[PDB]
Design a protein around this nucleic acid. Sequence first.
RNA 1: CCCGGCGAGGGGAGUGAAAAAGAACCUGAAACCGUGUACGUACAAGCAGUGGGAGCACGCUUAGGCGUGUGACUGCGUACC
RNA 2: UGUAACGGGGCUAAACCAUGCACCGAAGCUGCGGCAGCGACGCUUAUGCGUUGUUGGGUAGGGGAGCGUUCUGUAAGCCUGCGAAGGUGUGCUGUGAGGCAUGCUGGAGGUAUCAGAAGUGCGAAUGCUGACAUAAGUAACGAUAAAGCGGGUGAAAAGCCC
Lengths: 56, 110, 150, 140, 117
Amino acid sequence: AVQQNKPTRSKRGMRRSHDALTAVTSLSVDKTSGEKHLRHHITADGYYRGRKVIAK
Amino acid sequence: METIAKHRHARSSAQKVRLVADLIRGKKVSQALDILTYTNKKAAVLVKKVLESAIANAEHNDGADIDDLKVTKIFVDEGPSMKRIMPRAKGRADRILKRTSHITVVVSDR
Amino acid sequence: VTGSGKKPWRQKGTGRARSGSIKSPIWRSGGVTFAARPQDHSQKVNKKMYRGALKSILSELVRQDRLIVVEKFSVEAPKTKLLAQKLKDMALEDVLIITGELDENLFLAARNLHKVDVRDATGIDPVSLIAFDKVVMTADAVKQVEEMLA
Amino acid sequence: MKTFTAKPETVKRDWYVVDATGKTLGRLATELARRLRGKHKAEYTPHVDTGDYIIVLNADKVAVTGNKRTDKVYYHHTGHIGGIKQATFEEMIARRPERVIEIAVKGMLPKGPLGRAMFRKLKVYAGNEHNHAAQQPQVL
Amino acid sequence: ARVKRGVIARARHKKILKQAKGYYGARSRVYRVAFQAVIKAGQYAYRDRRQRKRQFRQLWIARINAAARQNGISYSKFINGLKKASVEIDRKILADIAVFDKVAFTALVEKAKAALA
RNA sequence: CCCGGCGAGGGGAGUGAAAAAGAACCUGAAACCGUGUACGUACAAGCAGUGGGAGCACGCUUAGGCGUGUGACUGCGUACC
RNA sequence: UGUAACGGGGCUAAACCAUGCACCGAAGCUGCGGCAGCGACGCUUAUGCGUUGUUGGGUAGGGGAGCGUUCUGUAAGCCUGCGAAGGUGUGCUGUGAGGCAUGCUGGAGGUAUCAGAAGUGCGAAUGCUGACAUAAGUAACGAUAAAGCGGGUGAAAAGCCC
């Protein structure tokens, strides 16, 4: 049926509680002193130190 | 205040764009990218590239410390106005919006 | 107006409407809703509204106003820049430049700054008597009975 | 230059050991409320926001004197109007201090206003000189 | 004659009125309190200065029963005693001196005790 | 001049009296919103109140009863036409 | 379909009746201000100030009166770039539309006199012109039926391509 009821104020537009983010930490580790992710060594070429998948 | 490089205009609504601003208040300028690039949304990536535009300027433009500029508020505004159509009833509804956004970063110092 | 009568469509099958008339005098691109009548009417002053104790202001003011000197001859007239001195014998320099006279003479440069349409020649026009300070009447004995209009 | 008594929170709580238990109870259970508001402590805020602490002593001796005490049901049916029903009478329920036959304030601040936070302040234990579960500074 | 609605329509609603809340969105802050409903709030004060006073009456006259009832001197039955004297009538408030004058107020019962009691 | 995406937007410069005149050009409020100074505050009823006032972010006073609003207590009541 | 006849709670007398008697106690008549009508007085008198009588809820009707966004006038007349003025809130002023002011602003404008009357003093025409605060993360997301790498280029390819 048609929307014959109240606007999105307080009790609705308030609802943010469990819609939240995941507050991720991260390791500085200069083995990859730029292109690294959270603890995930490189977001692309799959390097660690020498020859692995397609790195070096 | 110091620096305010907001970006225009996105495709998203201000609701999805606003969902992340609070995280970066006060205590995250030193290492800002990790929470934003590893939460890889067209909101967080936008607040990333905002922050980046704002603070790559600040250290040059004033002479301040790039590590003491405390990223103090980050709010958003819409607008002006944009429309498009999809003829679902072709005499009534039919009329999708872009409310759009521009991220009023406001960075400041400790 | 040009605006399309009378009526476009029947007004059922939605469950929300009011109107559809296009015009109607109310809505948009129209108009003067009160029949458009040229109100052409000359509000009629009667014969003895002029006769008519009409001149009697010079009995209320009676001191500074009706200013009884002489006839409209004494100006150049190629230099009304000189007039305010030829106006020191009725004292008022340029205040309100009239005389309530008759004969055709060159005084009518007296409206040059806006003032009044002067009107002069016998039919002084009642709206000159209400409510200026120098309601000037100047001239000699043509004031008797019906002449009081002057 | 005002005559009223805000807050007062709470000035007068009158630490009295209710020797009235059973013996004349139905003459002063009816007045526990006009006590916790008044008749001595009426001197302060005799209608609003205050607190109170009598020193309770026993429960199941409600006395109450009349044909009431042996067919007067107590109901609650706390859920979906209860369906299946409860009927233990006033001397057979009073065998526990519970929620409706022991407090008297349930009958006397009846909607909940004035009463909405100071519910257990009277302790709601029972047990005499075997178990004084109340105040250590001197009672009355 | 051109109207275009002005000058007075907001003056009769807020201007100098020290009040910041006010009936929220659709019953007010849109516009709809402005003309015909603004009376309502102050109208709880239209009588009740005379009607709420009962609530506080018991507070004054407590210091003329709270200690006297023990000594038996119950305020309304002691008043059919008092009001035998055509000089004493205005006990209704001014007797409030009893909650701090105690140690000398405590003899005002002795006055006529061998007749009044 | 500087910054990013050989981009958007800003932060100063500056023609300018002005950029709250900046080429989504109108010297400019209305439906709704983002972050903050203080609240009441995740045991809620009853047009969300004006009261009656306790003390709170704050701003006066050689003390001197206040210039401020969410509105603990709860009183009154059903604003329509 | 929760015991649901004082509103509760059933009070062995607090009660029921009978005799006394003091407080509570709508707006209800009193303190005491203020005063629109219709009358009566002291006297005044263009007419009015207070005394005294009746008495002050007011959509159908006749009586009788207040002010404005400004047009048509008071008016080379006094006022303004030394600011003429809103949305507003320092302070009260009237019986009232509201203001004479003023506070903080705008950035150009007025009637403290009376004369003038009609585009005529909005929130309720199931609104109306352009709408959207609105149903939430609003398709069945476009039948549910396709996949797989190894690479290549590059500002960015599940698609372009071998």
